[PDB]
Amino acid sequence: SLALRLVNGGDRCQGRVEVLYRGSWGTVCDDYWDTNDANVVCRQLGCGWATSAPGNARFGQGSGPIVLDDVRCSGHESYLWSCPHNGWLSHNCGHHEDAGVICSASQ
């Protein structure tokens, strides 16, 4: 029921990262967003390994809440929200900072 998808990306394996928290799809700030974070996302979606982790709303801007920020994944986590971060709904971003991924399974 805590879910994740990629949107405005062209296939399911690349897009803006969004997370279903408490009935709402919300976004992820790009502040420490790297390919370790994007691997956790790609692995958790079954899209494999990450080819990049673009910041600056490269797949546009969400209009939900911003649900995660300062994500600092070791790389071995199952789910993005199990990584270290500043806690649910704690962020210092706007949606222009929304984080995205491209995965291997993207065409």
Residue numbers in the entry: 7 to 113
Task: Show me the paper's own sentences about this structure.
The scavenger receptors usually consist of one or more repeats of the scavenger receptor cysteine-rich domain (SRCRD) protein, which is an ancient and highly conserved protein module comprising about 110 residues. SRCRD proteins have been classified into two types based on the number of cysteine residues; Type A proteins are encoded by two exons and contain six cysteine residues, whereas Type B proteins typically contain eight cysteines and are encoded by one exon. SALSA, which is also as known as deleted in malignant brain tumors 1 (DMBT1) and salivary agglutinin (SAG), is a member of the scavenger receptor family that was thought to be involved in the oral clearance of microorganisms because of its bacterial agglutination properties.
However, the proteins obtained contained aggregates, thus requiring further refolding. However, the final yield of the purified protein was not high, probably because of the tedious steps and inadequate digestion process. More than 1 month after the SRCRD protein was purified and refolded from supernatant expression, a few protein crystals were finally detected in the reservoir solution containing lithium citrate tribasic tetrahydrate and polyethylene glycol 3,350. Although crystals were finally obtained, the crystallization could not be stably repeated. The highest resolution of the noodle-shaped crystal obtained here was determined to be 2.54 Å, and one asymmetric unit contained one molecule. The space group of the noodle-shaped crystal was determined to be P 32 2 1, with unit cell parameters of a = 71.08 Å, b = 71.08 Å, and c = 55.36 Å.
